[PDB]
Amino acid sequence: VRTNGAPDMSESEFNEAKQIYFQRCAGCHGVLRKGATGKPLTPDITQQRGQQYLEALITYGTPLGMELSKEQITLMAKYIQHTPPQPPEWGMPEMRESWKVLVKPEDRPKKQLNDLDLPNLFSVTLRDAGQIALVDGDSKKIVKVIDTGYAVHISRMSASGRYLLVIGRDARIDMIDLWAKEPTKVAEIKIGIEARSVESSKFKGYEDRYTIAGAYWPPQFAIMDGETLEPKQIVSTRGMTVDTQTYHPEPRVAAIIASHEHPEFIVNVKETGKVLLVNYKDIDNLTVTSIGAAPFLHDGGWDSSHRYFMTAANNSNKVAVIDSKDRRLSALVDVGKTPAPGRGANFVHPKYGPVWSTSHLGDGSISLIGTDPKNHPQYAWKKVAELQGQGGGSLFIKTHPKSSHLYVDTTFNPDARISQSVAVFDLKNLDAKYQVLPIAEWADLGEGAKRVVQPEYNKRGDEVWFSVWNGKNDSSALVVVDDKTLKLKAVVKDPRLITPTGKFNVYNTQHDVY
Amino acid sequence: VRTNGAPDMSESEFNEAKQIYFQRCAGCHGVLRKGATGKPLTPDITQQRGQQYLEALITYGTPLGMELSKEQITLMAKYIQHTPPQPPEWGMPEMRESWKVLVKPEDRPKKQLNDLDLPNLFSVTLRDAGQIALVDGDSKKIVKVIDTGYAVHISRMSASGRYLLVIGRDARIDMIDLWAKEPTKVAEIKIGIEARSVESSKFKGYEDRYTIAGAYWPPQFAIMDGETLEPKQIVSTRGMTVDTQTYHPEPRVAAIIASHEHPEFIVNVKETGKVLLVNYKDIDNLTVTSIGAAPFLHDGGWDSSHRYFMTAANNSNKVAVIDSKDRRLSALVDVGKTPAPGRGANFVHPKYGPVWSTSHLGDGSISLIGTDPKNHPQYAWKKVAELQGQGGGSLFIKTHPKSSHLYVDTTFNPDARISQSVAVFDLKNLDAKYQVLPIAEWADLGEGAKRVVQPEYNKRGDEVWFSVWNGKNDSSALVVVDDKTLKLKAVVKDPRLITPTGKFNVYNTQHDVY
Numbered sequence A, B: 001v002r003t004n005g006a007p008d009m010s011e012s013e014f015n016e017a018k019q020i021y022f023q024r025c026a027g028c029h030g031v032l033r034k035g036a037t038g039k040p041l042t043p044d045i046t047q048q049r050g051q052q053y054l055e056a057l058i059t060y061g062t063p064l065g066m067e068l069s070k071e072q073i074t075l076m077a078k079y080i081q082h083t084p085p086q087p088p089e090w091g092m093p094e095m096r097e098s099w100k101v102l103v104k105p106e107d108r109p110k111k112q113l114n115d116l117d118l119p120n121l122f123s124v125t126l127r128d129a130g131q132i133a134l135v136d137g138d139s140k141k142i143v144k145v146i147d148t149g150y151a152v153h154i155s156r157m158s159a160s161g162r163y164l165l166v167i168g169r170d171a172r173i174d175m176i177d178l179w180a181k182e183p184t185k186v187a188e189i190k191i192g193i194e195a196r197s198v199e200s201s202k203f204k205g206y207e208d209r210y211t212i213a214g215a216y217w218p219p220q221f222a223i224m225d226g227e228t229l230e231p232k233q234i235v236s237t238r239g240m241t242v243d244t245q246t247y248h249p250e251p252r253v254a255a256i257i258a259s260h261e262h263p264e265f266i267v268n269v270k271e272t273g274k275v276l277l278v279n280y281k282d283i284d285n286l287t288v289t290s291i292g293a294a295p296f297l298h299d300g301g302w303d304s305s306h307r308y309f310m311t312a313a314n315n316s317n318k319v320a321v322i323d324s325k326d327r328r329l330s331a332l333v334d335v336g337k338t339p340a341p342g343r344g345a346n347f348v349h350p351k352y353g354p355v356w357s358t359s360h361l362g363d364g365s366i367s368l369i370g371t372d373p374k375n376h377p378q379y380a381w382k383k384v385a386e387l388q389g390q391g392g393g394s395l396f397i398k399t400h401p402k403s404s405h406l407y408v409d410t411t412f413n414p415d416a417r418i419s420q421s422v423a424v425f426d427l428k429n430l431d432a433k434y435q436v437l438p439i440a441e442w443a444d445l446g447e448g449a450k451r452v453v454q455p456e457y458n459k460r461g462d463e464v465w466f467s468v469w470n471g472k473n474d475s476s477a478l479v480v481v482d483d484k485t486l487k488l489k490a491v492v493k494d495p496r497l498i499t500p501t502g503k504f505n506v507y508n509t510q511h512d513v514y
């Protein structure tokens, strides 16, 4: 057991110094030792550190985000310097053992045990901390900090409006009961090594029946019981591509959305460019429909009518329209460079009719795609208009049926001021340019990167919440703006609020209000 | 580039001395250098041969079944001594290039151009020769010897009764027109590295629309146009198992049968134990239903009513009943050791009603499973009776609706006499023991292994054809018996008849007459 220029020793040691890498350095440091937003563990940045320094750093840790014997550390040190490993296959045993039922279905209350205005609660992600903050929308006070998995990507609500599903990027799901005295974890499970999406069944006759979770590694998605989180089925997404029709060993599972028209899960499988329609009717025998879209599928959401899944194929610069009723690809609308909608933004255009919008990453723009074939067939599935935001590097854009301004964030732009503000449009005059809201400046944080991410409204549609994403150590905040006035309403600040990313309003998430 | 005790040299050479192994030593010598019925190429039987002898043997060949420069031979010699390789991924380019249209659909005749009694022709496989013999059923004369791929496993008829599909174990399919002056190849294609089954669409509204072929390597099946053999879709079978629900990197595609009730292909995926129902309605978007059966699925066939696919799960010692109408697993009937039906044998029992039978490999016996839930529900999906053949190592068993004797071969039994004869039962008295027919002795071949394989009837149901499978060099024959008399009718002998294995009667294969 040898690499291209670092300590080489054999056997057994390879298998174990790497099983110790996937211990609690799997989700933190990556699958192929990548390491987004932190400093890399790629063979060369680490070989430069050395056989002496690496032992030291692993042994005492560091103060920005750091149990093992001297022998296991000497190991990890000579072995992170080695050729990159063979990522484990996470099957049913590994998944059924990680399954822990913290509270039984009968032990759980029949009705609410708190004064909490549940539909107006915010499930805020605390990335680097590996927890979620249950912030109140009126009092602007953190009601409860719950211990979850690492870097909770998204939070989904169980259609009923009772349970809160949260998934870590380390593939650890946690179910939370919002009806308990103090809302705490009632079930947990690890569905892979690295994941992104969790989702519950939301069709007519199944509200909360099954829970699905998509994984980045292994290329699979796992279906569970939507009450106890009991693994029932696991399906591999390894297969042939849509473009070149060739084999691909790692087609990652991206976004998932429950079909409201049929008993299915609409699963975005990235690299292959196939949107899977996973029928659950008969679960011990799965029926999957492989709808070819466009390569590199990513995020997206529902249109105004909950019929069309508007997904972004980012490295193809197209938006795929999935018809959830007729179960086919409606069109591959060509949009600008690297589209990134999140769930998207739905409003009613005066001169074009009901639309769905998306901000971009390579380009800027906000493409307006028509979502109505019945009353506006000449505009549906075309980039009819086009608006212009501050610049590239945009992740989300938001709107609400209650009132008027359209918000587009720009989290990853090199221009400091742009990456610390949002472009607010007025729908009642689209030819009018945006108003730059100094979100991060209003926060009064002082020093840091102060990146502005995700515009998330409250139930009522009067407030718009922002996350000022700043380093683990730096002062981070949540900025609340009044939609009608366009002025600052409040700033939620706290040291427990370590790296706030995604904020999910319970009602708005549950009823898909975007 | 080094192994555990043989010449080691680097780079480039690994990739090429192995691309030359998959040249024309892929189908002949195996995927992982296995090598059924010939002497192995496993690292140790070959390392013992030596760096000097291997160069010699590859350079001059041998007289029992054997272009490259001295450098490429020196290569192959140092490199077959190396660690076993990384089997290529055969995608769409490699498959679309291998596609050759030898005759256009318009160039082909509107009606027959020969005196041939097409429904009573035998497509006989000549294994080691890599060809098929079109033997006549009345005159017992080879009408045409056609050049195909290596070791043509099965031969399937296009529902119409016009085209003859033949697939090599080297995954080379060849379509043959039986209406041409001299029936020759009208289309060919290579769908993988190693395959077994080919099949055409046989449901009500699709007779000859699409052609499917299952592969052992890569774990996939390819769907083509049933007229021109145009690759349209390729699907990977790599996935989770049914028993332990764990990942498996090589679930081999075994038997395939076209559903006569729905627009589907019933695909047996071995290792995973999943019987796939591949819907073709909309081909650019495939709907697959994963019906869990029992691990290690293999062969099988239809019942009397063409409704139930009776497949054998050999290393599970069960027979899975697939309902092609209601689209579910009907039952997992427990049978004896290592079941091997082929397509099976269907007859009407006097005291139990319509049944399906299967001979075995580990055990002997012929298990009788009831195939009627309507008139005989108390016997359906149970091993009601049980008959006894000569011994273990049995591959096929046959019967015909016209007349009375049931034949069970035994090709792989150590007892020479047993492996050279067939057990003939009388259905009109099942308590009566079998009559041992000295098939290979009647052939008058003299020296050899003289293995008896596959009882195949003629259209009329009066003759029963056997294949006396003897070595490439030895004298091989086809023995024809008269079913009514149980005596010898004729013996087809010829030197072109090198290793006769599977004999397929055109009408009997087409209309699934077993």
Ligand code: DHE
Binding pocket: A036, A127, A151, A152, A153, A154, A196, A197, A198, A253, A254, A255, A256, A257, A298, A299, A300, A342, A343, A344, A453, A454, A501, A502, A503
């Ligand atoms: C597949 C996917 C979804 C859709 C889920 C769904 O709705 O079913 C999604 C949505 C999301 C949403 C959902 C918002 C919504 O309301 O729609 C949030 C909060 C979010 C926070 C982040 N995303 Fe996300 N995102 C990825 C994956 C995804 N992001 C990546 O792979 C990527 C590009 C790289 C990575 O490092 O993981 C990435 C980076 C980020 C971030 O950097 C964020 C800001 C911080 C973080 O935690 O990593 N992503």
Ligand code: DHE
Binding pocket: B036, B127, B151, B152, B153, B154, B196, B197, B198, B253, B254, B255, B256, B257, B298, B299, B300, B342, B343, B344, B453, B454, B501, B502, B503
């Ligand atoms: C999956 C499969 C089928 C069903 C196809 C269908 O109907 O869709 C089948 C049927 C068949 C049938 C179909 C007969 C029928 O009418 O049902 C034939 C002729 C046949 C000749 C052989 N079979 Fe076969 N057979 C395999 C695979 C299969 N055999 C193997 O993998 C195995 C065990 C090992 C191997 O070496 O390939 C194997 C060995 C053999 C032989 O040794 C035979 C006698 C000679 C040869 O050519 O290799 N198999």
Ligand code: HEC
Binding pocket: A020, A021, A023, A024, A025, A028, A029, A038, A039, A040, A041, A045, A046, A049, A054, A057, A058, A061, A062, A063, A064, A065, A066, A076, A080
């Ligand atoms: C588990 C056995 C491991 C291994 C192999 C390493 N880590 Fe971590 N790591 C993480 C963070 C946030 C940092 C950056 C902040 C800081 O250093 O304070 C790091 C950095 C490292 C390095 C050094 C990088 C360099 O400068 O070259 C190395 C060699 C390293 N880690 C190895 C995060 C985490 C955790 C997230 C809380 C956890 C747990 C781990 N690391 C675990 C391990």
Ligand code: HEC
Binding pocket: B020, B021, B023, B024, B025, B028, B029, B038, B039, B040, B041, B045, B046, B049, B054, B057, B058, B061, B062, B063, B064, B065, B066, B076, B080
């Ligand atoms: C392609 C580049 C190759 C390689 C690597 C080899 N063969 Fe063949 N082989 C086949 C048969 C039928 C035999 C047995 C009969 C006989 O030897 O006459 C063999 C045997 C070998 C051996 C030697 C086995 C031993 O005694 O140790 C080796 C080293 C070997 N082959 C290498 C069949 C075929 C073919 C089927 C017609 C083809 C073509 C190839 N072999 C091609 C190659």
